[PDB]
Every structure is written in structure tokens, then in C-alpha cells.
Amino acid sequence: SHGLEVGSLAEVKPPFYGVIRWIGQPPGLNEVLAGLELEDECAGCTDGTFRGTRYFTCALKKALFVKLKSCRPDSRFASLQPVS
Numbered sequence: 001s002h003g004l005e006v007g008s009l010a011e012v013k014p015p016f017y018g019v020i021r022w023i024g025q026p027p028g029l030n031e032v033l034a035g036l037e038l039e040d041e042c043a044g045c046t047d048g049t050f051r052g053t054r055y056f057t058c059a060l061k062k063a064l065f066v067k068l069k070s071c072r073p074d075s076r077f078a079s080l081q082p083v084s
Contacts, residue, residue, distance in 0.1 A: 009074035
């Protein structure tokens with residue numbers, strides 16, 4: 001959504017911020033998910049696994065899986081203009 005890819009800085013509007021580490025469609029779902037690596041550990045978060053299956057690897061308790069169509073480029077950085 002909006003040309004998000006792995007490595008993109010994303011936002012899921014209290015907005016959450018994470019870097020997309022994985023995009024795909026787990027078995028059982030009919031929608032594409034983004035697996036986000038968040039900056040800090042979070043309660044309902046894994047180390048890159050979703051419903052038991054591993055999709056990427058990150059530090060303990062930093063992986064959050066959401067619907068890709070719920071993601072937007074991280075607005076904190078979207079307005080950043082370059083040097084001249």
C-alpha cells in the first residue's frame with residue numbers, strides 16, 4: 001500500500017511505528033499482512049512469528065503483524081525534504 005516494501009518506515013494509525021520486515025499472506029488469511037519490527041518490546045509481540053509460523057527474525061517481543069492495507073508511510077519522516 002503506497003509502495004511500502006520491506007525496509008520501509010511504516011505507521012499504523014495512538015499510532016504505532018515500525019519498520020516493515022516481511023510482507024505476505026499467512027495460510028488461513030485472505031489478506032496481505034505486513035510484519036513490522038517495532039522500536040521497543042511490546043506485549044502482544046513475537047520475534048518474527050505469526051500464529052506459530054516464523055516469517056522473519058527479530059529481537060524478542062518486537063514483531064507486530066498487521067494488515068498491509070492498514071499501513072501508511074511513517075508520517076514523521078514522510079515530509080522530510082533533501083538538501084536543495
